[PDB]
């Protein structure tokens, strides 16, 4: 999820852009034209607030560089299944309906008056005929990270932003479990993340192994996928892959074959499920403190793996060249008992 | 090369690059070797946890499994959250998430013999019958309403013992692990998703008593990796002045940061039973002198 968010990030500073001190404070505030293009929730907590956004779920860049947003045009008060993409200028020049507004199965507006968004910061009911455009889904303004926070319509803006930022700091555990409650944008956000392999053609698996897999295509071509095991991640954590397929199954194309870090059956899983209780207990949970049962400690429920990295080099010098050698002056045999011949 | 200060674990693999084997290397190097050390960390005190609703926290204490409160059927809880922080922060969503998680975990079966209840009119026809450890998903801005939760909480499947733990409101009767007697009032319980942040405690904890000293500034190194002491800001000097504490400030500025002979003598005195000798002239002052004397400004001392 962190990698996907970084790939989807929208920076506003750096070379060729304004600085922190010269940039005005107003630019850091929302604009009525941000709906559908840049999420208003996700944002760094630090001083770089408002200068780093994120694409919306359905946002697509036009060939010139103006962000677009899908819409279905109402011709005569009847919803149209076909959809078109509109930019800011064209969106302003038209009437955009509300997705949550009830609509009959035949496309007829049950309500004569439907709320609507207007030129700028204007919303007002209008007859159910002049309305021209309607949104696609209620989730058209949220970011990818914010789109997977259940009951987001009940929290506060600051709390929602804090949770969204926190979601990008999880640590891959040893035994992940899929959440019991979570939006439907979990598996899709994992398949597109790239950290999970997937079959290209519908074939039948001949044999599987902890280190590699071999799938037989229906055309008679054998293919093999190699899965890296316990390779240090770019930030110090571990990354692994465990195939979740059995020997002798005709796996269809597009079906996940292995689960990467923070995954459980081809869907994101950044944590576990714990039985919580809400009550002050002897002040040990005082002022945001937390109490944990030893069952978690003794069952590896929240056990993680971290891999360090060190390197040494022997570079030539004017006084000579350094060489790595088992022997070392004035050192007891016990100290170097671990070094090998080389 | 030696392991830095505060690292341990197994050695999983060693990569060595040699110029003899025709391996590209940075100019002026012959043998660069890297070693990977992997350590398994178990969650401990001083670790951050937080849900998906932005409610951070730290592990105040890890009580034994025999001390945590347990449900009427003997199922000890795994974590306890404070309540005063919910209404002030105004993040009531997590309560609904916990209720829904408990409902999904326990499994439900909404009555339909007499017909779909009015509150269950909009529920999908395939969502009226669930199984234990079921999976549910509420898309943002379109999910179960309050009435849906009210109805679902009233039809949860009973435990294998034949009794239902939680009430319609969602609260339950517990039993104190220490006193052994039930609490006077019910409490809310349920399953809530918990992540693990990257701000571990092992990285933060660090100590330094005596170690390598910088050669250019004559000051102890900095950073946990280098095994260096902590910084001492000027606000700390202001605070020390405020209390009127003088000898402490003198030590902090002279006998533990700069004075070489001072450090040696005080260390030896502590090793023995002798009293700590008074500090001397800090290296900073002597450097300032020998530098200001370079601008023809005769800086005398006037010891008299």
């Amino acid at each position: 999820l962190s990698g996907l968010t970084h790939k989807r990030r929208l920076s506003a500073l750096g070379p060729g852009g304004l600085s922190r001190e010269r940039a005005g404070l107003e630019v850091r505030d929302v604009h009525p034209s941000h709906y559908g293009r840049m999420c208003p929730i996700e944002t760094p907590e630090g001083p770089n607030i408002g200068l780093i956004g994120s694409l919306s779920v359905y946002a697509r860049v036009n060939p010139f560089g103006f962000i677009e947003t899908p819409y279905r045009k109402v011709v005569d008060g009847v919803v149209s299944d076909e959809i078109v993409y509109l930019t800011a200028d064209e969106e302003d020049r038209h009437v955009v309906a509300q997705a949550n507004s009830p609509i009959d199965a035949d496309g007829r507006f049950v309500e004569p008056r439907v709320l609507v968004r207007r030129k700028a910061g204007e919303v007002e009911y209008v007859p159910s005929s002049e309305v021209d455009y309607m949104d696609v889904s209620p989730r058209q303004m949220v970011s990818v990270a914010t789109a997977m926070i259940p009951f987001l319509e009940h929290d506060d803006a600051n709390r929602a932003l804090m949770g969204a930022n926190m979601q990008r700091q999880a640590v891959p555990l040893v035994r992940s479990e899929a959440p019991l409650v979570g939006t439907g944008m979990e598996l899709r956000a994992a398949i597109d993340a790239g950290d999970v392999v997937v079959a290209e053609e519908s074939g039948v698996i001949e044999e599987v192994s902890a280190d590699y897999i071999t799938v037989m295509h229906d055309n008679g071509t054998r293919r093999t996928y190699r899965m890296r095991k316990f390779a240090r991640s770019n930030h110090g954590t571990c990354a692994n892959q465990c195939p979740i397929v059995d020997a002798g199954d005709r796996v269809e194309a597009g079906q996940v074959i292995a689960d990467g870090p923070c995954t459980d059956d081809g869907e994101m899983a950044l944590g576990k499920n714990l039985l919580v209780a809400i009550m002050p207990w002897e002040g040990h949970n005082y002022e945001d403190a937390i109490i944990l049962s030893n069952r978690l400690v003794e069952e590896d429920v929240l056990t993680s793996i971290h891999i360090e990295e060190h390197e040494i080099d022997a570079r030539d010098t004017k006084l000579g060249a350094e060489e790595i050698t088992r022997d070392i002056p004035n050192i007891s045999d016990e100290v170097l008992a671990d070094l090998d011949e080389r | 090369l030696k392991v830095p200060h505060g690292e341990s674990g197994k050695v999983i693999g060693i990569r060595v690059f040699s110029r003899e084997d025709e391996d590209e290397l940075p100019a002026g190097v012959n043998e660069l070797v890297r070693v990977y050390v992997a350590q398994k960390r178990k969650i401990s005190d001083g670790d951050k946890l937080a849900g998906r609703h932005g409610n951070k926290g730290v592990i105040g204490k890890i009580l034994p499994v025999e001390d945590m409160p347990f449900l009427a059927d003997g199922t000890p809880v795994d974590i306890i959250l404070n309540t005063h922080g919910v209404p002030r922060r105004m993040n009531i969503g997590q309560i609904l998430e916990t209720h829904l998680g408990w409902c999904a975990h326990s499994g439900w079966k909404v009555d339909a013999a007499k017909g779909v209840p009015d509150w269950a009119a909009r529920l999908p026809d395939e969502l009226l019958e669930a199984q234990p450890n079921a999976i549910v998903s509420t898309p943002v801005f379109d999910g179960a309403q309050e009435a849906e939760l009210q109805g679902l909480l009233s039809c949860t499947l009973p435990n294998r013992d034949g009794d239902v733990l939680v009430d319609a409101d969602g609260k339950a009767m517990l039993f104190d692990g220490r006193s052994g007697e039930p609490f006077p009032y019910p409490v809310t319980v349920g399953y809530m998703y918990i992540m693990k942040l990257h701000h571990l405690v092992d990285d933060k904890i660090h100590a330094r008593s005596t170690g390598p000293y910088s050669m250019i500034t004559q000051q102890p190194l900095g950073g946990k990796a280098q095994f260096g002491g902590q910084r001492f800001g000027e606000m700390e000097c202001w605070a020390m002045q405020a209390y009127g504490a003088a000898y402490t400030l003198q030590e902090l500025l002279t006998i533990k940061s700069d004075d070489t002979v001072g450090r040696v003598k005080v260390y030896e005195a502590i090793v023995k039973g002798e009293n700590i000798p008074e500090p001397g002239i800090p290296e900073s002052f002597k450097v300032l002198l020998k530098e200001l004397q370079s601008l023809c400004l005769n800086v005398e001392v006037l010891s008299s």
């Binding site: 949550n100 | 998903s137 379109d142």
Partner: peptide
Amino acid sequence: NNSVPGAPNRVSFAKLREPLEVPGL
């Protein structure tokens, strides 16, 4: 409506249908 072949089954509190799948992220 699971676009991917073998994703886990998790019924949802669906009330409205989105006429287009999420584009390639």
